[PDB]
Design brief:
Helices cover 16% and strands 33% of the residues. The chain is of the alpha+beta class. A hairpin with a 4-residue loop joins strand 1 and strand 2. The longest helix is centred in the middle third of the chain and has 12 residues. It comes from Homo sapiens. Belongs to the ubiquitin family. This is UBC protein. It is found in: Cytoplasm; Mitochondrion outer membrane; Nucleus.
């Protein structure tokens, strides 16, 4: 399924994911597409900071949902 990742720069990238995918794997996908190292990535959805070990389905992230990417040093 397609999801959107909104960056602070104002740019939004599209990811192809499955609800069974872990947050860690999503961050890996972001690295492959944009080159941002996972340890610098903070993902936000529905006011929650997403935890690496959990899956997208755990957070009820549906298709065409938008995640917010904030970078930590």
């Amino acid at each position: 399924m397609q999801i959107f990742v909104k960056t602070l720069t104002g740019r939004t990238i599209t990811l192809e994911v499955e609800p069974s995918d872990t947050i860690e794997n999503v961050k890996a996908k972001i690295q492959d597409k944009e080159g941002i190292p996972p340890d610098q990535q903070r993902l936000i959805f529905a006011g929650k900071q997403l935890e690496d070990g959990r899956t997208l389905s755990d957070y009820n992230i549906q298709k065409e949902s938008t995640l917010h990417l904030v970078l930590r040093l």
